[PDB]
Design an enzyme around this catalytic site. Structure first.
Site, PDB file in Angstrom:
ATOM      1  N   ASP B 177       0.433  -1.439   0.234  1.00  0.00           N
ATOM      2  CA  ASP B 177      -0.326  -0.192   0.219  1.00  0.00           C
ATOM      3  C   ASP B 177       1.345   1.192  -0.215  1.00  0.00           C
ATOM      4  O   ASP B 177       1.351   1.505   1.175  1.00  0.00           O
ATOM      5  CB  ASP B 177      -0.615   0.117   0.859  1.00  0.00           C
ATOM      6  N   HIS B 178       1.168   2.162  -1.279  1.00  0.00           N
ATOM      7  CA  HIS B 178       2.388   3.121  -1.175  1.00  0.00           C
ATOM      8  C   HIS B 178       1.630   3.825  -0.607  1.00  0.00           C
ATOM      9  O   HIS B 178       3.248   4.793  -0.306  1.00  0.00           O
ATOM     10  CB  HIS B 178       2.186   3.342  -2.166  1.00  0.00           C
ATOM     11  N   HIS B 240      -5.573   2.483   0.009  1.00  0.00           N
ATOM     12  CA  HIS B 240      -5.548   3.349   0.809  1.00  0.00           C
ATOM     13  C   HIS B 240      -5.663   4.807   1.560  1.00  0.00           C
ATOM     14  O   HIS B 240      -5.402   5.541   2.911  1.00  0.00           O
ATOM     15  CB  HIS B 240      -5.052   4.942  -0.357  1.00  0.00           C
TER      16      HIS B 240
END
Ligand SMILES: [Ca+2]
Ligand SMILES: [Ca+2]
Lengths: 485, 485
Positions: B177-178, B240
C-alpha cells in the site's frame, strides 16, 4: 461609526509627548470618524500662547499625518489653550473657564478626560484641584489619564494612589503603559481562550516555563541622567514586563469584562512571591554593558551623564514564582536590557516534552509557542514531527505566521488605543492599583538588595544577549532562553 | 551503515512496475550503502531472457538514477534471471536453482524476500509452491511482499489470506500500500504522540470532525477497463483511504513497536460501524464526472473502454463512525475522486470551537490542523487570534510549514521505503489482516447497495470538488470540507 462625545484637557500640552504622540493619535480618532462634532481639546501648560499659536503647534504636530488640509483645519477648530500654573489653586478658575467654554461651543454633555502629561510631582496636586476647584463634569463621566511612572517604589506609589483617590475612584484612573497598548499583547487572551487546545494547556501539566523578553540594541544614549537611578529594573521590568506577565499568568476569568479580567490577573499577582536577600541572589541577575566589538559601542560607564562609579543595571533577568495551583513549579523568566543582540518584545511558552517513546535516537522535545510583539507581529509554533531520515526519528519544525502589510498598516498605535479606550471607559488594557502595588512590592525587594550592594553586578559585551549568569539561571531548572538573538 | 544481507526474488521481474519502481528503489538502497556484498536479486517471469538480456533490462531501469556507471555495473553483478511458469510445480526447481546459486555466490545466510509483482490470481499458487517446492530459506527469515490488490471483496480477501497462511505466518506477509509508504503519512504519529498538546486533544472532547481527502485532476484516462468495475470505492477508498484513517483513529499504543501500533489501529477498526442500505444512502455519496467547462474534459461515459450505460463511481464521499469512547460522536469524513479541482492527499482535523465568550461580533471559530501529504509535504494550523480592528474581535490566522528543498530531495519514495522496511522486518507501515478484512467488510456493505442500484449516482462538473451531495453530507452535522480546491 458611533460618535464619541468627549472633552479632553491636556496638562503639559506643549510637551514633546503631546506633539509626537498625543495630538496625532487624537487626529486619527477624528479621521476614523469617531470624533465628529461634539468634542473639544483643551491644552494647558506653563508657557503663554494665544489660540492662534497653540493651533499652529497642533498644526505642526499633525502635519505628517495630514492628507487633506481642510480636514486638518476642521479638526484644529476644536482646540483651545490657557497658560496655567498647576500649583496655583486660583489659576484653576481660568482652566475651568476654557473647559466650560468648549463644552458650550461644541455641546458636550460632560464626559471629561484630564490627561496629565506632566512631571510626576504634579499628579497629586492636579487631581486635588480638579475636584476642589470644580473642573469635574457634573454629568457624564470624569476620567484621569496618569502618565508614567506611577510612583518610584511602593510607598511613593501608594502615596500617589491615596492622593488620586481623594478626587477620583480607582475605576476612573487610567495609568499609562504603552506596552499594554500594543496590538500583539492583546492577542495573548485570544490565542489562549479562543483555542481550547491552548486554553486547556495553559497550566503546569503542559507548560515547562514561560519567557518574556524586552531587548533593545540601543544603549542609554541621552536619558542617562534619569536612567542612572532607574535602570532596567524600574524602566522596563516593574512596568512593562510585569504587566505582560499579568496577561500570561492570569486565571481563566468568568467573562471578558475588564472587571473579571482584572480579578483573574490579580489572582496571579496576589500569588506572586516576594524575595528576600538570598532569593534575589538566587533567582535574579543584574548586569551593566561593557564595550562591544566596535569602539563606538562604549561601556555604560563611559556614556554621557553616567557616574564613573555607577553600579546601575542596564540589564535584568530573573525568575518569578506564582503560588497558584495552575502555575505550581512553573518558572516565569523575564529579561530586559540595553545593548543586546536585537530589539524585540516577545513571549515564549515552552511546553513540557512528551513522554511517549518512539524508540528513536532523538526522542520528543519541548514544543514552543512564540508570540513576537515587536518589531513586527508574528506567531511561531515549534512542534515535534518526523525527520526525513531512513530510520524513524523525531525533529522539531517551525510553523509560522506574520502580520500582513495590510494589517501592519491598519494597526492602531498604542497611544491611540489608550486614549480611545479611556473615551469608551474600557480598562482592559490598563494596570489597576492591585497589579501596580504588587509589581512595586516585588521590585522593591530586589532594589533593596542592589542599593545595599548585597548582590553581584555582572558584565556583558554590547551586542550579546546578556551576562552568562542569565543562561546559568535557566540552566539550573534545565531550561534555556528560546530567543538567541 | 549496517549491511543489509538479503536475497530478493521478483516474480514478474519484466513488468513495468519492476522497471519503473522496484529496481530503481533497490538501486538506492545500494547507493545508500545498505546493500553491499551479501545480497542478490533474482528476477523471474514468463518470457525468456539470458543473464545478459536481463541485466540490460536492469541497466535501462536504473539508467535515469545512475551517476557513476562503474557503480551501476557493480550493482548489476548481483542480478540473475530464469524464465518460469508459476503454475508449473516442476519449473520451481529451476527457480530454487537460481536462488541457491545466488545464495552461495554472494554468501547470503537465508533472509529471503519474494516479491509478487504479478496478477492477483497467481498469489495463492506462488505461495503454495514456495513452500512445497523448497524455496524457503531454512535459516534467517522468509518474507512475502504481496502486490495490490489483496482481494476484491471480503470473501476473496479471506480466501487469499487462507492460501498465504498455508505457507507463511501473518507477520511474514507484507501487503503493498504505497500511501502507507508516504513520508507525511508517517508524520501523523509523530505530530500526535510527540506533542502533548495534540496527544491529549486527539479525542471527542476537542475534535469536531476528521477529514481525509484523496483528490485527483486526472480522469480515468486508460485504465477504464479495470476501473469500470473497481471505481473510486475500491481503487482509492477500501485501500489507501482506510489505511490513513487507521493512523488517525488508532488508540494510543503502549509503545511504538509495530505490534502495539497494529493493536491500537485494530482497536479502532474493530469499532468501525458497518452500514445497511438505509445507512449507506444516509452517510455515503457516490458520483460520476460529467463534462468540465472545456470540451477536452469529456464526461466519464465518453471515455475509452467505458460502457455507455455505466453507473461506476469516479467519486466517493462518506462518513465513518467509530464506536470507541474517544471517538464517540466524532464523524470521520473521507472523499476520493477523479476530475476534481486539485491533486492532493491531505488530512484536516477540525477542532471544536471554544465556548469562552469575548463579547465580540465574531466569536471563536474551529481551529484546524491540516497535514498535506501530496504533492508537497506541508502542515498548517489555523488558530483563533485578535483581528486588527478598533473594537476587540476574533479572527482565524494560518500558521504554516512546508518541507524544504533539502528535505524534499532527501525523502525516500514509497517503494524504497516498503522494500527497505521488509528487509528490516518492520511492519509499522503495512496493513495487517485485521485492518484489511474490516476495510473490506466496510466497503462490501456499500458495494452491495450500489450493485443493487439502491442508492443514487450523483453527477459533477469535471474540475469541481464533487457533487453538491458531498457538501450536504457534512452540512447535516454542521460541518464543511476544509479544502475547497
Ligand atoms: Ca529552581
Ligand atoms: Ca449525523
Amino acid at each position: 461609526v458611533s460618535e464619541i462625545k468627549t472633552l479632553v484637557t491636556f496638562f503639559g500640552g506643549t510637551g514633546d509627548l503631546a506633539k509626537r504622540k498625543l495630538y496625532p493619535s487624537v487626529f486619527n480618532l477624528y479621521k476614523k470618524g469617531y470624533l465628529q462634532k461634539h468634542f473639544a481639546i483643551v491644552g494647558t501648560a506653563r508657557q503663554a500662547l494665544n489660540d492662534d499659536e497653540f493651533k499652529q503647534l497642533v498644526r505642526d504636530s499633525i502635519k505628517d499625518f495630514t492628507d487633506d488640509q481642510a480636514q486638518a483645519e476642521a479638526f484644529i477648530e476644536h482646540f483651545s489653550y490657557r497658560a496655567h500654573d498647576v500649583t496655583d489653586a486660583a489659576s484653576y478658575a481660568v482652566l475651568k473657564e476654557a473647559i466650560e467654554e468648549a463644552a458650550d461651543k461644541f455641546d458636550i454633555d460632560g464626559n471629561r478626560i484630564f490627561y496629565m502629561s506632566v512631571a510626576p510631582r504634579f499628579f497629586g496636586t492636579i487631581a486635588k484641584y480638579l475636584k476642589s476647584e470644580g473642573l469635574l463634569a457634573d454629568t457624564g463621566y470624569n476620567r484621569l489619564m496618569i502618565e508614567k511612572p506611577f510612583g518610584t517604589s511602593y510607598d511613593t506609589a501608594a502615596e500617589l494612589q491615596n492622593d488620586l483617590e481623594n478626587a477620583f475612584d480607582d475605576n476612573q484612573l487610567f495609568r499609562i503603559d504603552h506596552y499594554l497598548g500594543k496590538e500583539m499583547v492583546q492577542n495573548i487572551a485570544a490565542l489562549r481562550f479562543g483555542n481550547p487546545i491552548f486554553d486547556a494547556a495553559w497550566n503546569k501539566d503542559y507548560i515547562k516555563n514561560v519567557q518574556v523578553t524586552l531587548c533593545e540594541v540601543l544603549g542609554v544614549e541621552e536619558r542617562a541622567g534619569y536612567y542612572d537611578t532607574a535602570g532596567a529594573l524600574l524602566d522596563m521590568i516593574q512596568n512593562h514586563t510585569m504587566q505582560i506577565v499579568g496577561w500570561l499568568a492570569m486565571e481563566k476569568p468568568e467573562s471578558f469584562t475588564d472587571k473579571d479580567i482584572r480579578a483573574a490577573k490579580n489572582a496571579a499577582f496576589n500569588a506572586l512571591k516576594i524575595y528576600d536577600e538570598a532569593e534575589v541572589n538566587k533567582y535574579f541577575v543584574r548586569a551593566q554593558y561593557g564595550a562591544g566589538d566596535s569602539a563606538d559601542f562604549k561601556p555604560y560607564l563611559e556614556e554621557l551623564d553616567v557616574p564613573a562609579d555607577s553600579k546601575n543595571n542596564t540589564f535584568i533577568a530573573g525568575e518569578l514564582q506564582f503560588d497558584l495551583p495552575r502555575w505550581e513549579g512553573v518558572p516565569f523568566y523575564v529579561r530586559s536590557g540595553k545593548r543586546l543582540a536585537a530589539k524585540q518584545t516577545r513571549v515564549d511558552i515552552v511546553f513540557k516534552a512528551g513522554t511517549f517513546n518512539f524508540g528513536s535516537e532523538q526522542e520528543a522535545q519541548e514544543a514552543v509557542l512564540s508570540i513576537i510583539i515587536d518589531p513586527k507581529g508574528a506567531i511561531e509554533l515549534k512542534l515535534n514531527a518526523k525527520s526525513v531520515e531512513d530510520a524513524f526519528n523525531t525533529r522539531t519544525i517551525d510553523l509560522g505566521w506574520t502580520v500582513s502589510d495590510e494589517d501592519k498598516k491598519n494597526t492602531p498605535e498604542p497611544y491611540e488605543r489608550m486614549i480611545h479606550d479611556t473615551m469608551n471607559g474600557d480598562g482592559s488594557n490598563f494596570a489597576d492599583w492591585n497589579g501596580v502595588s504588587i509589581a512595586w512590592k516585588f521590585v522593591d525587594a530586589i532594589s533593596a538588595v542592589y542599593t545595599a550592594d548585597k548582590a553581584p553586578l555582572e558584565t556583558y559585551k554590547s551586542g550579546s544577549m546578556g551576562p552568562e549568569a542569565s543562561d546559568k539561571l535557566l540552566a539550573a531548572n534545565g531550561d534555556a532562553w528560546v530567543f538567541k538573538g
